[PDB]
């Protein structure tokens, strides 16, 4: 619905925080 | 950098909810 929008990531704090339980 | 900074400790409100579901 946005003209001139651009792909990128946007980065999310919490999944490290999933990825180091899933670890442990 | 900064003067006049003040050693203290800044509580995490997420953390604590991860040692809790730790040991499960
Ligand atoms: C951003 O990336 C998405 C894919 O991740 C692009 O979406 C594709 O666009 C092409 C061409 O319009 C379509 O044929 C595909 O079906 C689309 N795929 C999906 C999953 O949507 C999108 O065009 C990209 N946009 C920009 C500005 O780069
Ligand atoms: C805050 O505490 C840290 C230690 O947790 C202090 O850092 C030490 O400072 C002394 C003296 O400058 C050094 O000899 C140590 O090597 C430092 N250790 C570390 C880990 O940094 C710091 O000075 C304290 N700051 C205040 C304002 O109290
Ligand atoms: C910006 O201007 C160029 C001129 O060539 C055009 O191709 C492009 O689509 C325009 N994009 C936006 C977001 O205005
Ligand atoms: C505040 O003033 C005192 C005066 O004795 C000085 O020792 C201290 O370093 C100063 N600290 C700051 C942050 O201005």
């Known amino acids: 619905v946005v ?9 999310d704090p919490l999944q490290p925080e999933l990825d180091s339980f899933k670890e442990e």
Request: hydrophobic share 45%.
């Open 3 to 11: 003209i001139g929008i651009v792909n990128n990531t946007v980065y």
